[PDB]
Design a protein around this nucleic acid. Structure first.
Ligand SMILES: [Mg+2]
Ligand SMILES: [Zn+2]
Lengths: 96, 159, 174, 92, 165
RNA sequence: GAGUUUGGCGGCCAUAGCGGUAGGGCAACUCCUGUACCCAUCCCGAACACAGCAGAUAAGCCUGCCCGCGUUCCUUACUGUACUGAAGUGUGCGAGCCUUCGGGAACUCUGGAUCGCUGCCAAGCUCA
RNA sequence: CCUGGGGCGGGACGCCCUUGAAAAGAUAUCAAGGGCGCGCAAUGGUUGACUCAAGCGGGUCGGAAACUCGCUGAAGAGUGCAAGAGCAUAAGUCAGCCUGACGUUAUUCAGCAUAGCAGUGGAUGACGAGACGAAAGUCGGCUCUAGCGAACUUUUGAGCC
RNA sequence: GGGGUCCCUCGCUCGCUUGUCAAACUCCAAACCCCCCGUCAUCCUAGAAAGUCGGAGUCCGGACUGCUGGGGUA
């Protein structure tokens, strides 16, 4: 039977491209975010700590608070609001 | 087991042989026939299929045998070059009880070919064009698809 | 040798062997200015750096070429010159409005009584705040330049000129 | 596996790190004056006794290695959620 | 600044086992080298030697500077200044073999120890090859700056007088 | 007030890599020189560390060049092809496929470009 | 109990990974590939120093089988074990020092999308103690995802009612 | 490495040019689709989104058009 683990069916959700494999840009890991700012969840597979679910990969979260290094995001999953803790390595700002 | 069983293409490609078990290999022996060195054949024709069909390896071997024998008896042993382009990569599995645990065992391979995809390419001289064309006609009678011949090289050389 | 399209070239600083990015990620998590001390074979240089996504920016700096104007004549690439450069950097950064920062020796190896730790002791003695352990500090006679008697008698001008430069720079910035 | 007989860890009572001696916990004999023994004596009569006629169940493939970490300073031992192992020995 | 100067001298003793023999090997290597000598560990176990993984097999020493120059002069003396082109590497780093440590004067043969042959190799580089070894901004040396085999034999003839044929 | 060079820290992480040729250093950098000391070798002052007068731009480095390999981009053709969103009293014995409106490749090909761009600070010089 | 009727066979009866699955999420079958019910005081933590697999070249019966030197080498190795993902001045290897394989405690995830649901984990934190380190940091075991179990009962640990 | 002075036969192995593939392959890569922002549109104080409570039924479904859906000779 199939499993129910957190990494289930994440062969390409949590995979890095060939020319971004290895160390990531360190400037992405100290990008400070403001209160209420909209940020995109684009999970960095190399950074194995503070990662959200693969189910939130590609969702825009509204920053509502900080819990140390990571940020608190109000993410939408279908019809429910979720609080998704993610470090700045996995987040990316939305530009207008 | 007639070819009508494993003919229609309604299933995905079952070719990754490291995740299956014990495929009986194809009976197809060769894929190049005739002069495998003379690249200077002016008139070149190809047998193309005009449906989406799965050709069994036994069908491919029978077609190759009839076409090669006709070409050897028509244009001599070294007066032609005939190429079977497609390898049988798909593995054909039969549910050898009832429908419980229906994923069958591999009972042979086959080649999945698209419409207008060339099966046999034949290169011949000017005078041996008709014999090569007629042998390719006999080759497609052993295949499960409607087949039409198309001329690759020397369209002006014939008419 | 980028043999094909599946070749991952290192980053440009890593290709040039000039920056470690794992150490850079470790240091940038502090959210504090870095005391980027770099030593050259003929003199020493110290910077205060704060990163922004456009690139690093440097607030204050100080090299061994500035020690001439304060009355220094000896070698600019020894422990004494490193200490004087660190003290000048600390006083100048205090004057500009910076008093904190974590040490950053980068790719340079860590060993007690080096020129980098001499510059660190110079920065600490100027009032600039930087977390450090006194084990890696050099002895006071080494900062004075008490090596002189081994090889050369023309090195004997070092300690008096070091003390003179120290008092001059302290009067200059305070 | 192996765990040292003595190693320095955290004593939650003295609230400091100290050398602790590890001792295997001994499953004690069941007391005959507990409330369940009195209830079992009170439920014995003619016929089935319910939970006291049950034969106790089997065992897991590997039991946990039940260990106690007695502090060497204040002597107060504590015990923590222990690993599960087949063969256990003490390194000295 | 193109002279292929002697970067280092390498000496190795392929004992092939350990016990008393390897200790005697490292002791005599230290005696004839004038420098502390380290051993070597087998990478995998092979029943033909009957060796085991992570088991000491041989001993090696790295010689530099005037010690390297004097030891290489002694090795050239034992070889009688004779060497052929096949010894040289593709980049001029030579390596040859000797079969008797008693060829070295100053050391007395012992009946227990026997005769030992040690493989010596000296690497020849150019003044500026430190860039590929340092820790600050290490870069690869190009093809032009490297040392050719003919330049190596020319250097060995001019500095050591070893004719290579 | 501005510019060139040099150094440190970088951002984007190959348009930046791999490879080949031609030029330069006053200041700088490097190579390079020793081992009293600080520090160090699973041995070697090789690296690190320290103290540096020389000598050398031969390499690091900088400038220009070469389409050769890789990458990226445009370009003509393949081609509005493949594939596909919607609808269809359109069609095939069947596996299926067609028309309309709306999107739209990849490979290859033609002719070309790309042998990095840029941010901060400091040292110098040359400002009008 | 499931079950292309039931039975025989099997466990698709608990947990984990790839495809199926139609490029958000979800998605069944006795669907396909399978694995787990463990091992480890180091096969763990941290700092420093290095880089691996495999080729070509040189070295003496040390053979085309050992060990050693140079060159190519973004990984073709290793990381305990399924599968997938991660990693190169390293998440690998070696060595120094250590025991964070620490006591207590709060949230949100995901088992269980949407959308209730057990004991459990797994990511952020907090209080108190440390280890290594110049410091930044890292350490709540072994790179991430399996290795396990309610109520009742008994035993044990510290102090109390 | 295989065969009738290891004289020479010679299959694998490595490059240039061809011929085919993948559901557990990807240097590439759509159209749908999903999160967020702006705009228009529609709903909305005659009550948006949210919340609390009362009442259930329901967990035998089936079909048409697509996904070459999976399995199957069908
Ligand atoms: Mg039943
Ligand atoms: Zn205690």
């Amino acid at each position: 039977t199939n499993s129910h683990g957190e990494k289930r069916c994440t062969r390409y959700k949590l995979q890095k491209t060939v020319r971004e494999r290895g160390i990531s840009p360190v400037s992405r890991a100290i990008q400070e975010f403001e209160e209420g700012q909209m940020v995109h969840i684009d999970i960095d597979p190399s950074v194995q700590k503070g990662m959200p679910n693969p189910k939130f990969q590609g969702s825009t979260g509204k920053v509502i608070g900080q819990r140390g290094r990571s940020y608190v995001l109000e993410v939408r999953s279908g019809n429910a609001m979720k609080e998704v803790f993610s470090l700045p390595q996995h987040l990316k700002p939305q530009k207008y | 087991k007639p070819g009508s069983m494993y003919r229609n293409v309604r299933q995905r490609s079952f070719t990754r042989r490291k995740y299956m078990g014990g495929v009986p290999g194809s009976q197809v022996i060769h894929y190049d026939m005739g002069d495998k060195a003379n690249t200077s054949f002016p008139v070149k024709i190809s047998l193309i299929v005009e449906e989406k069909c799965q050709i069994r390896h036994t069908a491919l071997e029978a077609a190759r045998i009839t076409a090669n024998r006709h070409l050897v008896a028509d244009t001599g042993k070294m007066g032609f070059y005939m190429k079977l382009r497609v390898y049988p990569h798909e593995v054909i599995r039969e549910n050898k009880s009832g429908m419980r645990r229906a994923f069958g065992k591999n009972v042979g391979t086959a080649a999945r070919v698209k419409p207008m995809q060339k099966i046999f390419t034949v290169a011949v001289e000017k005078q041996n064009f008709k014999a090569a064309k007629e042998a390719l006609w006999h080759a497609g009678q052993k295949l499960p698809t409607p087949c039409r011949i198309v001329v690759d090289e020397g369209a002006e050389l014939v008419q | 040798m980028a043999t094909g399209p599946r070749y991952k070239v290192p980053f440009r600083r890593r290709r040039e062997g000039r920056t470690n990015y794992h150490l850079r990620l470790k240091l940038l998590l502090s959210r504090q200015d870095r005391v980027v001390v770099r030593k050259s074979s003929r003199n020493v240089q110290i910077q205060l750096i704060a990163p922004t996504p456009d690139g690093d920016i440097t607030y204050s700096s100080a090299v061994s070429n500035e020690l001439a104007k304060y009355g220094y004549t000896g070698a600019t690439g020894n422990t004494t010159a490193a200490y004087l450069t660190g003290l000048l950097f600390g006083l100048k950064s205090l004057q500009k409005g910076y008093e904190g920062g974590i040490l950053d020796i980068g790719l340079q190896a860590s060993s007690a009584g080096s020129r980098v730790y001499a510059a660190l002791k110079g920065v600490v003695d100027s009032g600039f705040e930087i977390p450090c352990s006194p084990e890696v500090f050099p002895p006071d006679e080494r900062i004075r330049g008490e090596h002189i008697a081994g090889y050369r008698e023309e090195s004997s001008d070092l300690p008096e000129q070091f003390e003179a430069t120290k008092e001059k720079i302290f009067a200059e910035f305070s | 596996m192996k765990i040292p007989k003595r190693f320095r860890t955290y004593c939650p009572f003295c609230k400091t790190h100290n050398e602790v001696v590890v001792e295997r916990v001994k499953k004690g004999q069941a007391s005959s004056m507990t409330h369940i023994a009195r209830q079992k004596k009170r439920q014995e009569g003619i016929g089935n006794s319910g939970k006291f006629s049950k034969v106790p169940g089997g065992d897991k493939p590997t039991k946990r290695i039940w260990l106690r970490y007695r502090c060497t300073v204040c002597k107060k031992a504590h015990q923590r959620p222990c690993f599960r192992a087949k063969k256990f020995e003490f390194k000295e | 600044m193109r002279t292929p100067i002697v970067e280092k001298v390498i000496v190795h003793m392929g004992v092939g086992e350990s016990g008393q023999h390897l200790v005697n090997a490292e002791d005599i290597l230290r005696n004839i080298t004038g420098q502390e000598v380290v051993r070597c560990f087998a990478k995998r176990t092979l029943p033909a030697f009957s060796i085991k993984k992570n088991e000491p097999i041989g001993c090696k020493v790295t010689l530099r500077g005037q010690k390297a120059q004097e030891f290489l002069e002694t090795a050239l003396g034992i070889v009688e200044k004779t060497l052929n082109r096949s010894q040289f590497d593709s980049f001029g780093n030579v390596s040859f073999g000797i079969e008797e440590h008693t060829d070295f004067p100053g050391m007395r043969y012992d009946p227990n120890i026997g005769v030992f042959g040690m493989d010596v190799t000296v690497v020849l580089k150019r003044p500026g090859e430190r860039i590929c070894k340092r820790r600050i901004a290490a870069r690869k040396i190009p093809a032009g700056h490297r040392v050719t085999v003919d330049d190596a034999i020319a250097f060995l003839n001019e500095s050591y007088g070893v004719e290579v044929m």
